[PDB]
Write a protein that binds this ligand. Structure first.
Ligand SMILES: *[B]([O])([O])[C]([C][C]([C])[C])[N]C(=O)[C]([C]C1=[C][C]=[C][C]=[C]1)[N]C(=O)C1=[C]N=[C][C]=N1
Lengths: 229, 230
């Protein structure tokens, strides 16, 4: 699982892969780790597939019962204190890394990263999942803050594609959605139209010369591809 | 007869008398007034001291519920302190669970359901209290009044107490659209010194409190030298 959420001027861009894998076997290759809480507030979802699904639909029922009694819109800081309350009083029993990102008219675009420990940190961009450790040095070099909506979509799709190329846990589709003052626009690009893959990376075309022919010199001349020559 | 002995008894015409008898405990209580001044809300009440030796600050009927809201009670003082200590608990819940200040129309709807829940059961009696919720939340300046029946209503101005009919006509001469919080402390305190008579009590003073943009959206009492003298 590689999940991330990046803020721009208008709102936020949620990004995630699509694969639940029982250790080493792909149980599902079209998962949806972008969970709707309210219309403009979603959450990314990593870790245990059952422990985080039960939290996401328990928060989303407190959060819709709140919205009816208030009669107004729900702030993102409200939804991020319902995950922190539940991920802290269950922190020894669940495995839950949650990234809460959304839009509210008061504060604009907000990103909250709630790790497995149960803390809450408000950010500009957040990373999560087992594939997130590849993306710290990728965002230190290639990420500049203050992009547009069209640039954050193509960046976060290029960000996830570098993550599941090296990670074995992550893979599949790339599901992204933007949350701002307009309608929430979702987009799912496949594997075969992904912006990066190592199989078509032109520097991994040459095989590593392991299987040397039996020869008279120490001059390395590539692999042995035939029984005759 | 026995049709006005508890709360779970409708009358022959659909009335509940122990609620309506509790409304006579507010109508025989000291005079309350309030005003919404387009950047905040000012609330003033008259403390009827029964002895010369009471300390200044005793029996303050104005209590702060949150940083931006506060409930002044009109009626019985110890019954209204169960309303204040409940609405504080309702405002602590929104700060600790939902990470947001409680809205003005939402705090008043929690007061009107706590006061109503003691008018439906036989073991409980209704409050002898009218609570005035003065708030300044992200929905603007709010002014609500919860009666002992549990009915809440947003007002622009309100008079409650004994002389609530004479002080209501004195509020109709104010503006509430061009009215500011700077002038209204002198106006509303001057309502109480004209609506109330000194031929019954000798010791009466006024207690004013506001919440507005000048006090940084904080529900505070007055500095003592802003109130008119008499
Ligand atoms: B992602 O791989 O972390 C994913 C996130 C989930 C919330 C949709 N989790 C899983 O794939 C888990 C296994 C796992 C892998 C790595 C870290 C933690 C957990 N999958 C399951 O829990 C699972 C396994 N078999 C059947 C159903 N669900």
């Amino acid at each position: 699982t590689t999940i991330l959420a990046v803020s721009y001027n208008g709102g936020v861009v949620l990004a995630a892969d699509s694969r639940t894998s029982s250790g080493t076997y792909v149980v599902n290759r079209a998962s949806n780790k972008l969970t709707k809480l309210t219309k403009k507030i979603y959450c990314c979802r990593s870790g245990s597939a059952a422990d985080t699904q039960a939290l996401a639909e328990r928060v989303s029922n407190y959060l819709g019962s709140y919205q009816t009694d208030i009669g107004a819109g729900v702030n993102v800081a409200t939804a991020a204190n319902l995950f922190q309350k539940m991920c802290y009083m269950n922190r020894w029993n669940i495995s839950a890394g949650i990234i809460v990102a959304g839009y509210d008219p008061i504060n604009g675009g907000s990103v909250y990263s709630i790790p497995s420990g149960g803390s809450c940190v408000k950010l500009d961009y957040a990373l999560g999942g087992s594939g997130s450790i590849f993306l710290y040095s990728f965002f230190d070099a290639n990420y500049k803050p203050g992009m547009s909506k069209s640039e954050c979509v193509a960046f976060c799709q290029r960000a996830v594609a570098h993550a599941y190329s090296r990670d074995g846990s992550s893979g599949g589709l790339i599901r992204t959605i933007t949350l701002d003052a307009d309608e929430p626009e979702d987009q799912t690009i496949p594997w075969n139209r992904s912006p990066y893959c190592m199989e078509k990376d032109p520097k991994y075309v040459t095989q590593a010369t392991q299987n040397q022919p039996f020869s008279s010199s120490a001059k390395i001349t590539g692999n042995r591809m035939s029984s005759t020559g | 007869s026995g049709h006005d002995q508890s709360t779970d008894v409708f009358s022959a015409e659909g009335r509940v008398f122990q609620v309506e008898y509790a409304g006579k405990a507010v109508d025989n209580s000291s005079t309350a007034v309030a005003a919404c001044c387009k950047d905040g809300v000012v609330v003033a009440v008259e403390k009827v001291h029964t002895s010369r030796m009471l300390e200044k600050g005793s029996n303050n009927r104005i209590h702060a519920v949150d940083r931006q809201a506060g409930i002044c009670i009109c009626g019985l003082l110890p019954d209204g302190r169960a309303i204040v200590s409940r609405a504080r608990q309702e405002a602590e819940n929104s700060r600790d669970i939902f990470a947001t200040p409680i809205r003005g129309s939402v705090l008043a709807n929690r007061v009107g359901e706590f006061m109503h829940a003691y008018t439906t059961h036989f073991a409980y009696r209704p409050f002898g209290c009218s609570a005035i919720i003065a708030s300044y939340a992200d929905d603007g300046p709010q002014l609500f009044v919860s009666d002992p029946s549990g009915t809440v209503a947003g007002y622009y101005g309100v008079a409650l107490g004994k002389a609530k009919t004479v002080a209501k006509s004195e509020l109709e001469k104010l503006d509430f659209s061009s009215l500011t919080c700077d002038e209204a402390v002198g106006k509303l305190a001057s309502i109480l010194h004209e609506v109330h008579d000194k031929q019954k009590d000798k010791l009466y003073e006024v207690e004013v409190a506001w919440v507005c943009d000048k006090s940084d959206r904080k529900f505070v009492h007055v500095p003592a030298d802003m109130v008119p003298a008499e």
